[PDB]
């Protein structure tokens, strides 16, 4: 609903902008290991219960 | 504009309540600590501090102590580039002067934080046959010596001008203690009734 302490909004805000595909250019670095983001989250699956 | 102060009329002007007030605990307790030890039966060893040198005699003696001050720190240093007669003061120094019997009068203070510090002292002067007197306050032996408290004072010696002034005091002093040493080692003290209970008994016997 509407209610959120801003501290919770800052955290969902945190996880929200953290919920992004890895940059394309990061995969092109030497010795790179990363491909997909292993910490992609989906609201319908993992829950950030705050 | 006179006011009735019957019950259920004009409110009273604020009368003193010191008597029924609830005091800070340290107040109630120093009051009760003083009550408690009048109305218990104190031992003769400890009661003797309740008995004490007559003040006209006391005032004479403390003026004598004041006549023989210990030298001040400013002067003691100044003397030592090369002591003036003064009263022995301090429980440790005064204890020697008794045992060595160099003391020729001693002035136990009446009150002491643990009376134990001095509780023995009257028996010790009585044994060395040193004249001694109990006196009202360690604060007065205090100022007499320039200290803020003195558990004891010892007139070990005096200039010739004050020889007799000491002697009459020594016999006005051991007249009350050392002479009464047989009496003093006997009087159990305390057991005073409250005068709220003395009067109650004054009247119960009044009614019978």
């Amino acid at each position: 609903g509407r209610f959120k302490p801003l501290a919770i909004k800052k955290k969902y805000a945190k996880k929200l902008k953290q919920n992004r595909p890895v940059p394309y250019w990061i995969r092109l670095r030497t010795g790179n290991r990363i491909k997909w983001n292993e910490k992609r989250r989906h609201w319908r699956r993992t829950k950030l219960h705050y | 504009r006179p006011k009735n102060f019957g019950i259920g009329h004009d409110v009273p002007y604020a009368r003193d309540l010191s008597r029924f007030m609830r005091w800070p605990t340290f107040v109630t307790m120093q009051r009760k600590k003083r009550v408690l030890q009048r109305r218990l039966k104190v031992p003769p060893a400890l009661h003797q501090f309740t008995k004490v040198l007559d003040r006209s005699s006391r005032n004479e003696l403390l003026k004598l102590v004041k006549k023989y001050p210990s030298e001040t720190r400013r002067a003691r240093r100044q003397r030592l580039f090369d002591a003036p007669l003064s009263v022995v003061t301090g429980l440790q120094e005064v204890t020697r002067t008794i045992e060595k019997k160099t003391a020729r009068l001693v002035m136990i203070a009446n009150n002491v934080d643990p009376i134990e510090l001095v509780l023995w002292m009257p028996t010790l002067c009585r044994a060395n046959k040193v004249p001694y007197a109990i006196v009202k306050d360690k604060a007065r032996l205090g100022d007499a010596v320039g200290r803020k408290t003195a558990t004891c004072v010892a007139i070990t010696d005096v200039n010739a001008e004050d020889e007799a002034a000491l002697k009459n005091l020594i016999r006005s002093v051991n007249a009350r203690f050392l002479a009464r040493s047989d009496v003093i080692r006997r009087q159990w003290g305390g057991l005073q009734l409250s005068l709220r209970s003395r009067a109650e008994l004054r009247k119960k016997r009044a009614r019978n």
Binding site: - | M21, R22, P24
Partner: protein
């Protein structure tokens, strides 16, 4: 002379008792970057209203004072919101005496 059932402690006298720039907040910390979305471009021209991501801890009155200092223009109002992302977003509306368009383009926008 006590006149309370209980004692109360007396008034006693009581004796009265490195960054070169201590104020880390600043016009330049408050306002950050103008926003260039097309909801905001609707406001610069249609509402005389600059949009800014602005420091999230800044408040409205500080955002006015910051526009006054950074862009030299009065803000008739500044209703901020903090974005779902966590950035704060001010829609500052300029006084009519100040164009929001002449100023935004002066701003490199």
């Amino acid at each position: 002379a006590y006149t309370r059932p209980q004692f109360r402690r007396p008034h006693t006298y009581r004796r009265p008792s490195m960054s070169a720039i201590s104020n880390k907040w600043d016009a330049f910390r408050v306002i950050r970057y103008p926003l260039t979305t097309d909801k905001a471009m609707k406001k610069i021209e249609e509402n005389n209203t600059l949009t800014f991501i602005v420091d999230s801890n800044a408040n409205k009155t500080e955002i006015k004072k910051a526009m006054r200092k950074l862009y030299q223009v009065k803000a008739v109002k500044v209703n901020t919101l903090i974005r779902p992302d966590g950035l704060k977003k001010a829609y500052i509306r300029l006084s009519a005496s100040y164009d929001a368009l002449e100023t935004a383009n002066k701003m490199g926008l």
